Amino acid sequence: PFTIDSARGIFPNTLAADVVPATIARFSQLNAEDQLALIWFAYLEMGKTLTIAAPGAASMQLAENALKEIQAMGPLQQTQAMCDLANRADTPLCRTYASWSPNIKLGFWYRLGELMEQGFVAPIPAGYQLSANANAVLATIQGLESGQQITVLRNAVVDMGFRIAEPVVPPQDTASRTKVSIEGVTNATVLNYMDNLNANDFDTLIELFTSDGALQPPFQRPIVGKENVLRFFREECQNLKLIPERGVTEPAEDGFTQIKVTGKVQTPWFGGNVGMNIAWRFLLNPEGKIFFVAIDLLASPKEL
Numbered sequence: 511p512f513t514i515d516s517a518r519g520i521f522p523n524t525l526a527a528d529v530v531p532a533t534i535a536r537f538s539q540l541n542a543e544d545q546l547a548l549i550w551f552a553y554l555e556m557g558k559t560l561t562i563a564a565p566g567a568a569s570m571q572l573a574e575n576a577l578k579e580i581q582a583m584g585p586l587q588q589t590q591a592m593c594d595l596a597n598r599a600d601t602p603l604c605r606t607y608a609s610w611s612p613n614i615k616l617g618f619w620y621r622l623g624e625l626m627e628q629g630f631v632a633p634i635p636a637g638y639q640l641s642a643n644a645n646a647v648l649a650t651i652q653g654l655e656s657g658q659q660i661t662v663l664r665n666a667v668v669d670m671g672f673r674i675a676e677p678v679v680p681p682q683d684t685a686s687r688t689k690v691s692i693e694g695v696t697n698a699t700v701l702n703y704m705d706n707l708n709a710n711d712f713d714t715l716i717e718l719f720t721s722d723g724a725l726q727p728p729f730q731r732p733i734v735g736k737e738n739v740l741r742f743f744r745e746e747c748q749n750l751k752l753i754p755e756r757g758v759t760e761p762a763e764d765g766f767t768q769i770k771v772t773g774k775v776q777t778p779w780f781g782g783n784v785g786m787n788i789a790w791r792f793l794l795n796p797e798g799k800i801f802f803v804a805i806d807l808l809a810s811p812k813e814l
């Protein structure tokens with residue numbers, strides 16, 4: 511009776527920060543140069559209090575040829591290439607960009623941001639004024655908590671263009687692994703999920719899932735089956751820090767158990783400087799395997 515798509519409804523009182531997809535949808539309506547200017551503005555102002563971590567060396571190497579090609583272009587053509595990405599135009603650059611994992615896309619724009627600051631890539635025109643709709647989108651972004659701001663910016667970047675990923679880091683040494691503690695939750699599957707993800711131990715992590723089980727990242731559709739979920743762990747889930755705090759455990763239909771945990775997560779892009787408020791919603795089968803886990807970005811503290 512449980513389907514993945516029906517399991518999406520467990521713990522319906524959980525208020526997700528759906529202002530994030532709402533804002534992305536508004537952003538996606540904008541003129542391309544407005545999109546690019548808006549992120550430049552948001553990025554400049556955010557950088558006054560938050561520092562982005564440098565892209566990894568492997569990621570920089572993978573994006574290097576594309577970056578070099580843009581830098582060699584004349585200023586008008588550099589701007590056109592960036593507009594192509596924002597417009598999701600079909601071009602060789604846009605197809606290369608689309609083959610990249612999120613971290614490589616993010617590191618590509620990190621470097622273009624440095625080069626625009628230095629004047630070596632064509633900057634946003636001086637004195638540029640955003641459109642009416644764009645100004646309102648930027649205002650909305652600047653009113654969000656930092657965890658929601660960086661999620662808007664990430665999703666905007668990942669949406670550009672029209673599989674290349676970083677190498678997979680070896681799992682953390684067993685002796686140096688730390689274990690989480692969750693108020694009210696001693697469920698071994700949940701604790702093993704948190705601890706193995708915190709150790710980048712994706713091969714152990716995936717064995718917690720049913721063959722047909724699914725993982726639903728914030729504001730995304732469920733990723734279904736062990737092959738696809740493992741691919742997602744390896745491409746996108748390295749070096750996270752999960753800090754679960756508290757939870758609740760309840761029976762579900764057919765001998766299943768449903769568990770909701772709240773806490774914080776840190777991305778390696780910002781470390782301890784941005785703590786995202788997160789809920790995990792687990793649906794476990796009678797053997798304790800993960801049939802479904804959703805990860806939600808919460809609308810505020812006071813969803814924790």
Ligand SMILES: CC1=C(/C=C/C(C)=C/C=C/C(C)=C/C=C/C=C(C)/C=C/C=C(C)/C=C/C2=C(C)C(=O)CCC2(C)C)C(C)(C)C[C@H](O)C1
Nearest residue numbers: 546549550553619620622623660661664727775777779805
């Ligand atoms: C795009 C662009 C520019 C550059 C923009 C840049 C450099 C933006 C960079 C933004 C970054 C680095 C954002 C990073 C965001 C990271 C986030 C939101 C990570 C969140 C991860 C989470 C919530 C992980 C949760 C997970 C948990 C807890 C699990 O249990 C399972 C795995 C999963 C991943 C779901 C500039 C150059 C500034 C201007 C130009 O005109 C346009």
